[PDB]
Every structure is written in structure tokens, then in C-alpha cells.
Ligand binder design. Structure first.
Ligand SMILES: *[C@@H]1O[C@H](CO)[C@@H](O[C@@H]2O[C@H](CO)[C@@H](O)[C@H](O)[C@H]2NC(C)=O)[C@H](O)[C@H]1NC(C)=O
Lengths: 53, 222, 205
């Protein structure tokens, strides 16, 4: 599908939402060294501006 | 030929902070996380946290959450471990470990450093308070000794009869106290038939305090 | 410290040995380290059974339910170190390997009272000297007189003697008001399961 290569950190922006409930995917949930990928079902809005002209 | 070189031994006062170095060589420094595991003297290993040399992101344990700060220098391939506000229990040997090259990653420490010994010692130079250990009445051959009590700093040399009595002499290692002072005990096994006609004196020498003391061990009353 | 390791495991040069590691839950990997005194631990077994290059095939690992075990067949004189089992970030209590003396013996305990000149000051220290025992595995307990006391006790980890045996020394700090109170005391030295006790009484003449 249409995958937008959005280079981000911490927050995943403009990504594909999960259907039904939110999903918690991890290679090893009992492992702290492996990152925890979270996928929302309802998108949250964030407005960023650079007021400097 | 993975080479891990840490810093030398450090000595800090309780409440200060110390930064521990860990130089890596023989592999790609920015491809492997760097862990930190300490071991209290006479105790077991304890994992503190891993640091990713790539981005610098760490993972401090909840026990040290808010005290340790792990940084790295990718130019020189050296990881750092700084512990703030040192307590009495922070005396330990601190290692920096690395994962296996093969077999997935992160939790099978194949490579370790030689270890860095940091210690918290709060004490002033104090002379020992030597006390005799009178024998009881088997012997045939009674046992008597001396108690080198409350002294700092080590080491103290204990001889019997100014060197004339060597057997059987057994000077035990000292024990560390909460006040920083040390305490040990030397004991000599001697025939009880000599009690009353032979002399037994323990020669305690404390060079850091310039205190030379000799205690007489008389057979206790009755 | 969710991983339980026995403090001492027994084995003879030539025969096999087994170190058990009991950890809760069953969904992980177990690793084993060998730490000689003065040196850093050494990865001996990873992922339950696999073994990194190049440690001898005499080391092997196993896991059944909530219990992982490390087996060393054909013990030598160089297999003398501390063994720890690992699970993710947690570690075990450690395991000491005792080889063979052969001389199997119990500790010779000598107990001393606080000196009379120490009682002139407001201090009191008990000297419980433990000599030539083997192997180096001793747990010291103090009763007052029979009620166990664990306050103010300083126990020594066994150190090797000149005759390849071990020695220890436990102390119990007291005050003159506490020293002249009870009628007796004890320094129960438990070694290899057997307890060697020496009587001490403040009834000074
Ligand atoms: C981004 O947020 C917008 C907010 O409107 C969502 O956009 C709508 O999604 C529905 C679902 O197909 C469409 O019918 C609308 O035309 C969309 N509107 C716009 C302006 O795009 C969108 O779902 C969100 N996208 C992501 C990836 O979170």
C-alpha cells in the first residue's frame, strides 16, 4: 500500500492506523532492550508552527 | 580480538560522584550496546543499564534511576558511567560488558572488561585499641591471642614475642565496620604447661598512625 | 534476585556435577557465567544449552519447567570459580565449586570474651575464631543465650590458609550493660551441615 517514508522519533506521524483496538507489537515484551511499537486506532492531531518569519 | 580497557581504581568520599571509563577496540563500536554490571565485594553481579553508542539512548535500572548517567564518545570509542551521590553500599567492582557478535544480540555477555574498583571510605587515621584474649582451661596446649580493635587504615603487622614465637601463629584478616575502622585478631596455640613460666606477647604495629603496642596475654583468673 | 542458586555444590575431580537454577515462569533463555576470583565472568552457556567458542564440551546446560541446570563432567583443578545463571537482566545468587581436599574436616572454633580492659571502657567485642576447615563454606550464628541474635554481628568470608584450608572470624559488638546482662552466649559455626558450638559466659572471676 501507500507507505509514506516519514522520518520521525518517538511519535509516528502520518502512519497507518490499526483497525478495531489499538495494537501493542514487540519482539519480546518481557525484554526491555527491544523497543515497543504502538499503533493507535483513533488518530491524534498535532499542529506545529514556526512563527519566525 | 575484542579489547575492553577500563580506567584505574578510584577513591571517592561518600556523597561525591565518579565517572568510570570503558574503552573498546577490535570491533565496530557503534554497532553493539554497552552494558554496565557491578559486583559488591563478596557479593553477586548486578545489572545497572545499557547504552546504545549509535544514538546515546540508555536504559537505567529503577534502582539507579536518577543517579547514574551513561554517556559515550564515538570518536574515541569509549563508554562512560557516572554515579552521583555515592552511598556506603556503592563500593563495588564495576564492569562494562558487550553482547556476542553471533546469536541475536544483547543478553549473552561474551566480552567483559577487567573491572574498575571504586570505593567509598569515610574515616580518619586512628590508632588501634588492642585488647588481650586470655586463654581458658584439651590443652595440654592452650590458645591465646589479641584483639586489634577499631583502627584505620590498614595494614597492621602482628608478630608474637617480637618474632621469637612463630608457631603456631595465625593472624586472621580484618573485618570492615560501618564507621570505617578495621578489626582483626591473631591467635597462637601454645602448651598450657608453659602458662606461668613462659612469656607470650603480641606485637601490633600500625604504621599509618605511628602506633607500636605490645599486649600481654596472662592466663585469666581461676 | 528471582533466580535461586545453591551457595555450595559438591563434586569430585573426574565425576560430574550439577548446578540448579530455579526461576519463576517458563518463557525465556538461561545463560551461565564462570567468574574466577580477581577476573571477570566468562560466558560458558548461552540459550539454555548452546555453548560459545571455545569452552570445553565438559560444560552442558539443560532446562525443565522452572529449573535450569549446568552440568560439568570430569571436574579438573581449573574449574574453580563462581557460577551464575542469567535471565534477561537478572542474575542468580552464585555457586561456589569446592573440588576436593581430599581431607574432609570440620572447623576448630576458639571463642574469646571481651577483655577486662575493654570493659573498663564502654565497649565489648566477642572474638570467635574459626580455623582449618574445608571446604570454605561457613555460616555463623549467635544466640543470646539461646535466642538467635543478628544485630551487631560481623562475619568473615572464608580465606585460604597456608595448609590449603580455610579460616574465618566472626565478631559480635556489645555494650557493658548488655554484656553483664545475660548468663551465656554462643557462636554456632555451621559447616557442611554440621554445627560446631563453643560456650561463652560473662561469669568472669
Ligand atoms: C489524518 O487525519 C485526517 C483528518 O480528517 C483523516 O482524513 C480522513 O480520512 C477519511 C477516511 O478515508 C477520508 O474519508 C477523509 O477524506 C480524510 N480527510 C482528509 C483531509 O484526509 C485521515 O484518516 C488521517 N490519516 C492518518 C494516516 O492518520
Amino acid at each position: 500500500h501507500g507507505i509514506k517514508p516519514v522520518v520521525s522519533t518517538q511519535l509516528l506521524l502520518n502512519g497507518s492506523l490499526a483497525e478495531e483496538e489499538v495494537m501493542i507489537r514487540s519482539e519480546d515484551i518481557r525484554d526491555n532492550a527491544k523497543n515497543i511499537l504502538v499503533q493507535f486506532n483513533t488518530p491524534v492531531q498535532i499542529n506545529c508552527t514556526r512563527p519566525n518569519n | 580480538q575484542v579489547q575492553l580497557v577500563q580506567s584505574g581504581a578510584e577513591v571517592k568520599k561518600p556523597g561525591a560522584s565518579v565517572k568510570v571509563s570503558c574503552k573498546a577496540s577490535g570491533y565496530t563500536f557503534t554497532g553493539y550496546y554497552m552494558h554496565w554490571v557491578r559486583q559488591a565485594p563478596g557479593q553477586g553481579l548486578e545489572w545497572m543499564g545499557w547504552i546504545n553508542p549509535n544514538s546515546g539512548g540508555t536504559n537505567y535500572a529503577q534502582k539507579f534511576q536518577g543517579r547514574v548517567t551513561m554517556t559515550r564518545d564515538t570518536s574515541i570509542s569509549t563508554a562512560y558511567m557516572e554515579l552521583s551521590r555515592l552511598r556506603s553500599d556503592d563500593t563495588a567492582v564495576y564492569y562494562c560488558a558487550r553482547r556476542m557478535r553471533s546469536q541475536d544480540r544483547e543478553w549473552d555477555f561474551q566480552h567483559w572488561g577487567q573491572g574498575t574498583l571504586v570505593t567509598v571510605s569515610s574515616a580518619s587515621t586512628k590508632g588501634p585499641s588492642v585488647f588481650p584474649l586470655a586463654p581458658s582451661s584439651s590443652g595440654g596446649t592452650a590458645a591465646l591471642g589479641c584483639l586489634v580493635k577499631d583502627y584505620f587504615p590498614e595494614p597492621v603487622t602482628v608478630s608474637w614475642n617480637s618474632g621469637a614465637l612463630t608457631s603456631g601463629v595465625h593472624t586472621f584478616p580484618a573485618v570492615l565496620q560501618s564507621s570505617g575502622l578495621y578489626s582483626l585478631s591473631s591467635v597462637v596455640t601454645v602448651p598450657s604447661s608453659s602458662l606461668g613460666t613462659q612469656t607470650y606477647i603480641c606485637n601490633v604495629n600500625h604504621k599509618p598512625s605511628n602506633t607500636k603496642v605490645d599486649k600481654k596475654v596472662e592466663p585469666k583468673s581461676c | 534476585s528471582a533466580l535461586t542458586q545453591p551457595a555450595s555444590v559438591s563434586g569430585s575431580p573426574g565425576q560430574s556435577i550439577t548446578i540448579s537454577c530455579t526461576g519463576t515462569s517458563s518463557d525465556n533463555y538461561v545463560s551461565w557465567y564462570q567468574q574466577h576470583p580477581g577476573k571477570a565472568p566468562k560466558l560458558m552457556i548461552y540459550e539454555v544449552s548452546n555453548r560459545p567458542s571455545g569452552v570445553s564440551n565438559r560444560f552442558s546446560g539443560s532446562k525443565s519447567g522452572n529449573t535450569a541446570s549446568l552440568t560439568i563432567s570430569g571436574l579438573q583443578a581449573e574449574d574453580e570459580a563462581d557460577y551464575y545463571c542469567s535471565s534477561y537482566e537478572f542474575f542468580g545468587g552464585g555457586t561456589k565449586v569446592f573440588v576436593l581436599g581430599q581431607p574432609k574436616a570440620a572447623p576448630s572454633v576458639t571463642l574469646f570474651p571481651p577483655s577486662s580492659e575493654e570493659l573498663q571502657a564502654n565497649k565489648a567485642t566477642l572474638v570467635c575464631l574459626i580455623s582449618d576447615f574445608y571446604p570454605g563454606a561457613v555460616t555463623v550464628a549467635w544466640k543470646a543465650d539461646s535466642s538467635p541474635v543478628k544485630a551487631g554481628v560481623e562475619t568473615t568470608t572464608p580465606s585460604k590458609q597456608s595448609n590449603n584450608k580455610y579460616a574465618a572470624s566472626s565478631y559480635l559488638s556489645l555494650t557493658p550493660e548488655q554484656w553483664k546482662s545475660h548468663k551465656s552466649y554462643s557462636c554456632q559455626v555451621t559447616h557442611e551441615g554440621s554445627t560446631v558450638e563453643k560456650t561463652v559466659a560473662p561469669t568472669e572471676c
